[PDB]
Amino acid sequence: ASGADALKALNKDNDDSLEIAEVIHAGATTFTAINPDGDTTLESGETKGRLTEKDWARANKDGDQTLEMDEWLKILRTRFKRADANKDGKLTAAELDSKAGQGVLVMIMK
Amino acid sequence: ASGADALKALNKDNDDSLEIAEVIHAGATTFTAINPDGDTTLESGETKGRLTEKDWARANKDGDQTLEMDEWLKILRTRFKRADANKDGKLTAAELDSKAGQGVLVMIMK
Numbered sequence A, B: 001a002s003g004a005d006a007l008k009a010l011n012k013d014n015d016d017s018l019e020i021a022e023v024i025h026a027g028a029t030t031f032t033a034i035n036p037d038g039d040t041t042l043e044s045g046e047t048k049g050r051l052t053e054k055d056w057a058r059a060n061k062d063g064d065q066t067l068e069m070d071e072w073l074k075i076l077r078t079r080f081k082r083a084d085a086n087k088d089g090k091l092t093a094a095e096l097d098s099k100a101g102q103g104v105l106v107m108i109m110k
């Protein structure tokens, strides 16, 4: 999806950017949206096309084979900061359209 | 609540302990449940009896006045490790009955 697409679906506060509260919340809903087996965790087979193998290495450090909500969202907040080019806490459509911004979108839109 | 109370209410996998996947899930459910004003965040007035001001200082470092899902769960995972006395990844009723374990329960039981 484009940055304009993401703003159409997720932005509700009469601006033209996504902030950390909007991004984390959408990331939490997407966590549930991509979990179809009825448990409470994400496995490597459920994150294909959204997380890489190295993403699991930097987030999953408790020794298990499961991604909990906080581990999932920690990757998201890091991608948020990587896409925040001018570091103002807001992600415009142009910032969401960057290669780093696209990494945010795959975690907040199913 | 006591450790035995928490296991009866929250433990579903036929053991005698709460693991990190079960704790994070109940903490995520509690986050939404104790948020009555219709937004997606927790404010300081909504975490009374569960978090202290120093908890906000160590978790809320993005400069706002709101606690997002990942900031809330980050406090919880730290409390989990503080309560995991033998560091085996499981919280028994006895560990949930300690001072550190009660800090876990106030974040996973509304």
Ligand SMILES: [La+3]
Pocket: A011, A012, A013, A014, A015, A016, A017, A018, A019, A022
């Ligand atoms: La906004």
Ligand SMILES: [La+3]
Pocket: A035, A036, A037, A038, A039, A040, A041, A042, A043, A046
């Ligand atoms: La799953």
Ligand SMILES: [La+3]
Pocket: A060, A061, A062, A063, A064, A065, A066, A067, A068, A071
């Ligand atoms: La994990």
Ligand SMILES: [La+3]
Pocket: B011, B012, B013, B014, B015, B016, B017, B018, B019, B022
């Ligand atoms: La258990």
Ligand SMILES: [La+3]
Pocket: B035, B036, B037, B038, B039, B040, B041, B042, B043, B046
């Ligand atoms: La609130």
Ligand SMILES: [La+3]
Pocket: B060, B061, B062, B063, B064, B065, B066, B067, B068, B071
């Ligand atoms: La915050």
Ligand code: NA
Pocket: A083, A084, A085, A086, A087, A088, A089, A090, A091, A092, A095
């Ligand atoms: Na920005």
Ligand code: NA
Pocket: B083, B084, B085, B086, B087, B088, B089, B090, B091, B092, B095
């Ligand atoms: Na333990």
